[PDB]
Amino acid sequence: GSSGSSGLKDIETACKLLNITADPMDWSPSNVQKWLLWTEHQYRLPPMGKAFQELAGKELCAMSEEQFRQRSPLGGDVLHAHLDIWKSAASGPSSG
């Protein structure tokens, strides 16, 4: 039903206090900001919300590591990284 294959089990836990969707490509309207300030505080990253303020769930996932670094040098890789886990789980458990 709701739960699928191991891995995202930890993702949902991050969407509970954020009230967002496990799927990063669905982050809207400005859910991205939530997924940002979340890990941003767990990795001590700078304020990206302003750089991604225009970016959305789809975009973020549609972007590339380098891209995430083009807006956030101190982080970048961090975003595209902590995100992979989401997008990966959102892209179906086996096929998607």
Q: What was the experiment behind these coordinates? A: NMR
End-to-end distance of the chain based on CA atoms, in angstroms? 16
Residue type, 33: Q
How many distinct structural domains can be found in the chain? 1
Give the tokens for residue 16: 């509970």
Q: Is there a cis peptide before residue 73, judged by omega within 30 degrees of 0?
A: no
Residue type, 51: A
Cβ atoms of 64 and 80 within 8 Å: the answer is: yes
Distance of CA 89 to the CA centre of its chain: 11
Distance separating alpha carbons of residues 45 and 67, to the nearest angstrom: 16
CATH number of the domain within which 9 lies: 1.10.150.50
- Structural domain for 82, as ranges: 1-96
